[PDB]
Amino acid sequence: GSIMPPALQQLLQTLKSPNSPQQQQQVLHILKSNPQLMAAFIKQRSQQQQ
């Protein structure tokens, strides 16, 4: 089949140390594209709890 790029890659490392927007690049493309695997960024885009 076909798998989407782990744009949330740099995001994971960002949780601890700083890192450039490598895979996270072209975030716009991530929006409304691959909310399944890249659910990180997608869901992260305005996520109000409770």
Side-chain angles (χ1 to χ4, degrees):
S2 71
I3 286 295
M4 50 255 120
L8 59 92
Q9 261 256 295
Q10 93 86 8
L11 277 303
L12 259 53
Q13 325 313 124
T14 299
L15 183 77
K16 174 65 177 286
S17 134
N19 271 127
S20 289
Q22 277 279 91
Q23 302 88 355
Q24 93 90 244
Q25 191 49 248
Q26 58 171 247
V27 293
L28 297 171
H29 278 252
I30 308 178
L31 275 290
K32 197 203 279 186
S33 160
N34 289 121
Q36 35 251 221
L37 181 144
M38 325 211 288
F41 230 77
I42 284 88
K43 298 289 195 201
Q44 272 174 49
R45 242 101 300 290
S46 203
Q47 222 294 80
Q48 283 191 334
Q49 63 82 45
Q50 199 196 56

